[PDB]
Design a binder for this molecule. Structure first.
Ligand SMILES: OC[C@H]1O[C@@](CO)(O[C@H]2O[C@H](CO)[C@@H](O)[C@H](O)[C@H]2O)[C@@H](O)[C@@H]1O
Ligand SMILES: OC[C@H]1O[C@@](CO)(O[C@H]2O[C@H](CO)[C@@H](O)[C@H](O)[C@H]2O)[C@@H](O)[C@@H]1O
Ligand SMILES: OC[C@H]1O[C@@](CO)(O[C@H]2O[C@H](CO)[C@@H](O)[C@H](O)[C@H]2O)[C@@H](O)[C@@H]1O
Ligand SMILES: OC[C@H]1O[C@@](CO)(O[C@H]2O[C@H](CO)[C@@H](O)[C@H](O)[C@H]2O)[C@@H](O)[C@@H]1O
Ligand SMILES: OC[C@H]1O[C@@](CO)(O[C@H]2O[C@H](CO)[C@@H](O)[C@H](O)[C@H]2O)[C@@H](O)[C@@H]1O
Ligand SMILES: OC[C@H]1O[C@@](CO)(O[C@H]2O[C@H](CO)[C@@H](O)[C@H](O)[C@H]2O)[C@@H](O)[C@@H]1O
Ligand SMILES: O=N[O-]
Ligand SMILES: O=N[O-]
Ligand SMILES: O=N[O-]
Ligand SMILES: O=N[O-]
Ligand SMILES: O=N[O-]
Ligand SMILES: O=N[O-]
Ligand SMILES: O=N[O-]
Ligand SMILES: O=N[O-]
Ligand SMILES: O=N[O-]
Ligand SMILES: O=N[O-]
Ligand SMILES: O=N[O-]
Ligand SMILES: O=N[O-]
Ligand SMILES: [Cu+2]
Ligand SMILES: [Cu+2]
Ligand SMILES: [Cu+2]
Ligand SMILES: [Cu+2]
Ligand SMILES: [Cu+2]
Ligand SMILES: [Cu+2]
Lengths: 341, 341, 341
């Protein structure tokens, strides 16, 4: 074995949560070992129960967030069980060479492969399947995409010599979906991804998703699965979109520090209302919560947010600050003596 | 009354103009009092006379620009006259908490509410109605959006320790509209917003506007309503888009200083050709005019600009500078001795 | 003649290549002389042989890249041969006044015009035809757009006082096309641009291209026309899009230094995965190749890249660096003792 570094196995966790990691570290470079297992399966993607033929890393949309530090090596075992029907591979936008690794990781059902890439570039980055040709968009918009974060060894900073530390981290993977409809407008169902392909490709061609979802379905991060926080906590929100632009916004908040292009060698922007994730990238925002209550986290095409699935909630515990905002007068009848022209 | 600051009432003016304000101020924080009255009404939105069922703040698309300074408090009386049919509210992207104020301002026809928010974040920001659910996009794309500018108390700067001062300010609100068509392709008319809803939502779902307009209609800021300027004037152009991306461009000019994400804690970019307003945001550009004549101000999807309504004009008075540009030879027949292969 | 500077004639070359130029220069300002000849012609735009009625500068999509330095004057002879059917003009986003020159360059078939503009603004910029009204988008999406680069006289820098020098430069013009289809879905053919107009405008109105291509057609820069480079070379990739957004990505690489808004008075961003060209602009990225092999250069809407034409290749010669990336284990059967749940 030429590369003589310590090895550390990481157990991935399902989004929107993130596996255990250090922000700053004084450990030297390691070989960080990850396993991704491809799973093709039918999944429910909206609140009416619509299904579609998904293809996933590790059974989730998005695939899980991987976290390493600058100078680590990332050794990924990609597994394509024989219950799957298609070949698969993986392209890390964090990696250098061989189409991000895609040219070294094509595996048929029943095979696995081991790729190592050096984490030379800091930031959050997309990873996605990319078998070749028209299969590249198809596998990605069927769900085969996630992200990796390469932290500086000293953790995050503000680009002005001040360290930034998060209390909590969430990973929001946004997915554009292209579900075929019948002549009456009802979504169609299929028995396999291969059977769904031709009709799906026709929808894809017109560049208008039927659904835009976080964490794999409409409503995934609302209701009992709202994201928790507390007043005072500095929360890092990683957002990825492997195929299509997005414009994240935290309703009732801001982006205190935003890396919209997602790369920690660049100073963040401050005090944003809405930021922009270019399709094929990950970005990140830090926000320190100042008020309790419900926050909606959306793409601020509000049609997509409210009508195609792209809303998450935060539920924030703590005490209300009437200095920042207050209801001076509750709703009341318009005074008789008013003129409102 | 706990908050013991001077109160100042502001009279709003219709876009693209902006109410009287100071750039730099040595006044301390104030409670700045604004009134917004919701008006649902049919409006003309294109040059062929197409109408649609609009919903507005203060009778205009966009709603008027509010201008305050960092550290002021903004006390907004939102009025929903009983002639309206729907509930309404307001979300300030400038504000912290309660979904931007939307969770504290839902009012039925016949009611008003008073919200106060502290202007802790500098920049230009969207405000918009957001009643809940699918009503959020519907109210916004029906016209219920505007912007607020929170200036630093020392006015604008270049991010490199130099003050910037504008001679003139204009507010360009861009609106994506989704007007239903009949089976022949003609735009449909309705007697109320409620009657228009179902057909409008179907158009919205396909994410392709029928119209993209400035100041509420195609041609609003062309012809006799071109925007005036003079050679030498430094003009601030605030641009908002509450739902959908835009790419502003001043044809024949530049953006000397551009805050495309719209937030004055970040240094502007210099010398832009075209900038980018992410849907759900406001941005701003300063330009010092150097040449007289007509300028077109567009979104630089030229299909949207020329064919869906999204062109404004500036008419600039002054003297032409032949050093910057000149017609060396006027159109003339191609010389007989020419070879043009 | 009032302007007493040396004159230099430049011979343009077809994209993706760039005419001979100096990066840094100690020559003083010159009048740089360029000729552009409009050519309307049918062109093949995809791998199935689909044609469409194009309109070009100098016979190519994009038009050729012009390169000058800050403070030069650019004297452009625009020629509209009498074999063409339409009037044409030119708008330089690099220029100040008269709608970028469009208001001084409208020429009928059989005419030519000479425009001079001073290169006061550094960066890469779009130029495009803009006759007036609905003809503006039509001429642009028919192919009448290119770019000009205005280099600082000291050449490029990193925004932190370090010079940057490229070994190679390529110009990637991306074109959104709107080809009519018949009732069966087959692309229609026409005998002239005028005959194609009405059906084309209907496609344009729905804001969804049928094709998104580099260098004028699907596959233009793949196969025998892949872009060459070598390990170690710093390559400047200029990307323009005159009408519609794009999100460039170099698969297997990065953007070491990226001016996504395209203007050299602003420091570049570092280490990008994917960048963003706002419609109506040019941007530029520098990358130093570190690995040999094939790279795909795409817009990272992968549907557009793989299915609508928007993929180029680089073929990079040199030696593989197993430190940066290696295939630890080639594809092999999943071990019997594995558990992959
Ligand atoms: O295609 C729109 C048209 O189709 C119908 C069924 O005929 O609804 C479908 O489309 C809706 C919007 O996507 C979904 O809410 C629903 O799951 C789906 O059946 C019509 O109701 C709609 O009018
Ligand atoms: O710079 C990020 C900064 O935002 C902070 C500033 O200290 O606060 C902003 O919001 C708070 C609302 O009170 C204010 O302190 C501040 O004046 C405004 O920009 C933090 O939450 C943090 O360091
Ligand atoms: O739907 C496009 C198709 O509809 C018609 C009327 O049949 O025109 C309508 O659409 C045009 C483009 O939006 C508008 O200019 C016009 O106001 C509207 O009636 C056809 O003329 C067009 O061919
Ligand atoms: O930095 C904004 C700056 O743009 C200025 C520079 O002084 O001018 C630009 O356009 C003018 C066209 O003459 C030139 O002064 C300059 O060299 C170029 O970048 C102003 O209009 C202003 O301060
Ligand atoms: O319109 C989509 C539908 O049309 C057909 C011909 O009937 O294919 C056309 O569209 C394809 C996608 O753009 C092209 O690949 C081809 O050049 C064109 O004829 C059908 O095959 C397709 O099903
Ligand atoms: O800053 C651009 C810089 O990227 C470089 C840094 O020297 O390299 C990056 O990629 C290389 C991969 O080894 C590493 O040197 C570096 O640590 C990482 O950001 C060059 O190719 C260049 O100056
Ligand atoms: O080696 N210190 O954590
Ligand atoms: O299935 N995804 O969270
Ligand atoms: O070959 N890919 O499905
Ligand atoms: O302010 N949120 O849509
Ligand atoms: O208090 N001075 O304007
Ligand atoms: O109606 N708006 O300007
Ligand atoms: O309830 N909103 O129209
Ligand atoms: O240059 N304006 O389209
Ligand atoms: O004048 N020197 O190249
Ligand atoms: O025809 N263009 O490269
Ligand atoms: O008049 N332009 O084709
Ligand atoms: O990583 N490229 O699609
Ligand atoms: Cu796959
Ligand atoms: Cu990719
Ligand atoms: Cu409302
Ligand atoms: Cu909002
Ligand atoms: Cu033309
Ligand atoms: Cu232009």
């Amino acid at each position: 074995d030429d590369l003589k570094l310590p090895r550390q196995r990481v157990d991935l966790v399902a989004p929107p949560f993130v596996h255990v990691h250090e922000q700053a570290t004084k450990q030297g470079p390691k070989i960080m070992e990850f396993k991704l297992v491809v799973q093709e399966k039918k999944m429910v993607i909206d609140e009416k129960g619509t299904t579609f033929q998904a293809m996933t890393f590790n059974g989730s949309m998005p695939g899980p967030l991987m976290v390493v530090h600058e100078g680590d090596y990332v050794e990924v075992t990609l597994v394509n069980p024989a219950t799957n029907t298609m070949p698969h591979n993986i392209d890390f936008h964090s990696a250098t060479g061989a189409l991000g690794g895609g040219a070294l990781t094509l595996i048929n059902p029943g095979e696995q492969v081991v790729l190592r890439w050096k984490a030379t570039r800091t930031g959050v980055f997309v990873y996605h399947c990319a078998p070749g040709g028209p299969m590249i968009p198809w596998h990605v918009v069927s769900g085969m995409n996630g992200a990796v974060m390469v932290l500086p060894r000293d953790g995050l900073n503000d680009g002005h010599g001040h360290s930034l530390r998060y209390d909590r981290i969430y990973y929001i993977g946004e997915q554009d979906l292209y579900v075929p409809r019948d002549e009456k407008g009802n979504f169609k169902s299929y028995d396999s991804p291969g059977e769904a392909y031709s009709d799906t490709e026709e929808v894809m061609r017109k560049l208008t998703p039927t659904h835009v979802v976080f964490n794999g379905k409409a409503g995934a991060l609302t209701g009992k699965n709202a994201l928790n926080a507390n007043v005072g906590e500095n929360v890092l929100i990683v957002h990825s979109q492997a195929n299509r632009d997005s414009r994240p916004h935290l309703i009732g908040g801001h982006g205190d520090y935003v890396w919209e292009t997602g790369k920690f060698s660049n100073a963040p922007e401050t005090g944003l209302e809405t930021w922009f994730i270019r399709g094929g990238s990950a970005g990140a925002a830090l926000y320190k919560f100042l008020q309790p209550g419900i926050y909606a986290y959306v793409t601020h095409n509000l049609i997509e947010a409210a009508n195609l699935g792209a809303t998450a909630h935060f539920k924030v515990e703590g005490k209300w600050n009437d200095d920042l905002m207050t209801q001076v007068k509750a709703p009341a009848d318009i005074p008789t003596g008013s003129t409102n022209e």
